[PDB]
């Protein structure tokens, strides 16, 4: 069966404990699935963000409505929604605890492949509707191939060699050159100067 | 509402009271803990509440040493007989190297 499955809202063993919202699940490069597993053409996530169940339906509709199940397959790469989100009821004053578990999200970091697609097809073909779905994703995304993606990282290790701007961000943060760690995060020692909050700026080394 | 009560105990101040190389005396509490962290080694006793006191004056040293639990310590000799044969457990220990001798002999009487 070469079709994306019924990924579901609110998993079956539910989360009675209300997890604190940690925002470290969104920052920086991915540590999970950033590289392919038996596919060719995929959606890259060039920004952090959560993924609602209304976001999985837009993916499960417009891929499976416009992919031929004789010639192409598709698998998810993201997990199920597991992180619960609390919503206090409408119009309530501050304080009083934590509200009930309303819905669920899954956190996607930047540089993570979210949907994998392959088969007897080409990338100039499936750009027709992977670019359709990557604009409705709630982060900056772009459709990659196996071969188009690695073209991007060939340039990203070229921009760290080409430039004659004699200071990089890696040089100044690590050495603490202008006393700059008064204004820098510990996490921007180890990300690079590229990520900043949720957002990824690819246009800088 | 806020069904969560009782989260209002203070931190217990359990830690090392004498770091490595400190000149401890006979009876100072070297380290204080619950749920064993540093085991008592040479010339270091242990209390009821697992505090580590020194018994000999000297310098406190911290090492890594082989764990062999007491055979009537049933909670650990079961834990020993599940390892593969090449294994040992290596807890960390607190010693006191003594600094004064036990004494000298003094002439009191050309008698």
């Amino acid at each position: 069966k070469p079709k994306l499955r019924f990924i579901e809202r609110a998993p079956l063993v539910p989360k009675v404990r209300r997890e604190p919202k940690n925002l470290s699940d969104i920052r920086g490069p991915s540590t999970e699935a950033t590289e392919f597993t038996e596919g060719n053409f995929a959606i890259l996530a060039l920004g952090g963000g959560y993924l609602h169940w209304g976001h999985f339906e837009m993916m499960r509709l417009t891929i499976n409505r416009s992919m031929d199940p004789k010639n192409m397959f598709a698998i998810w790469r993201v997990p199920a929604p597991f992180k619960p989100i609390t919503r206090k009821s409408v119009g309530h004053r501050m304080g009083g605890g934590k509200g009930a578990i309303d819905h669920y999200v899954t956190p996607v970091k930047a540089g993570r492949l979210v949907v994998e697609m392959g088969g007897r097809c080409e990338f100039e073909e499936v750009q027709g509707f992977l670019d359709q779905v990557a604009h409705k994703l709630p982060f900056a995304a772009k459709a990659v191939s196996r071969g188009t993606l690695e073209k991007m990282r060939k340039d990203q290790e070229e921009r760290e060699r080409n430039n004659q701007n004699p200071w990089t961000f890696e040089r100044i943060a690590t050495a603490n050159m202008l006393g700059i760690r008064k204004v820098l995060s510990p996490y921007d020692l180890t990300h690079k100067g590229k990520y900043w909050g949720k957002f990824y700026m690819p246009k800088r080394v | 509402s806020s069904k969560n009560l009782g989260g209002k105990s203070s931190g217990r101040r359990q830690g090392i009271k004498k770091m490595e190389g400190h000149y401890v005396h006979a009876g100072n509490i070297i380290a204080t803990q619950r749920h064993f962290r540093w085991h008592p080694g040479a010339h270091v006793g242990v209390g009821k509440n697992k505090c580590l006191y020194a018994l000999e004056e000297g310098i406190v040293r911290y090492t890594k040493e082989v764990y062999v639990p007491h055979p009537r310590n049933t909670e650990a000799v079961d834990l020993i007989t599940r390892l593969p044969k090449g294994a040992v457990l290596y807890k960390t220990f607190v010693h006191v190297v003594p600094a004064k001798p036990e004494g000298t002999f003094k002439l009191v009487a050309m008698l």
């Binding site: 690590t174 050495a175 603490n176 202008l178 006393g179 760690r181 008064k182 | -």
Partner: protein, 120 residues
């Protein structure tokens, strides 16, 4: 949190291309530093406010000689952006006592030993 930084010891080893940008040779390193405060100790943490009061650097743009020994360098590594370091490069000798009454610093950092203001 914001806190005291260790700096890697990778950056305090000069490249072979770095010995051409400045005037030093790695064998025979210099004896004393010239340390001059060029930045304020305000809007800086309290540890940098304490280091500056030890190195004699309470006053901006007054140079100071500190030894080129690693116990001084350690204090200088944690305050190296408030200060400007040049080697004290003596052209002539160390001053003798008959000589020592008329010396000048000569920024370009050359503790010249004979300071008479007639021209060449």
């Amino acid at each position: 949190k914001f806190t005291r930084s260790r700096i890697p010891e990778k950056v305090f080893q000069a490249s072979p291309e770095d010995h051409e940008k400045y005037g030093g040779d790695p064998q025979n390193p210099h004896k004393l530093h010239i340390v001059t405060r060029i930045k304020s100790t305000r809007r800086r943490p309290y540890w940098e406010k304490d280091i500056i009061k030890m190195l004699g650097l309470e006053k901006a743009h007054t140079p100071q000689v500190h030894k080129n020994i690693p116990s001084v360098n350690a204090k200088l590594k944690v305050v190296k952006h408030l200060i400007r370091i040049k080697p004290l490069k003596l052209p002539q000798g160390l001053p003798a006592e008959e000589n020592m009454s008329n010396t000048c610093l000569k920024s370009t950092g050359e503790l010249v030993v004979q300071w008479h203001l007639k021209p060449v």
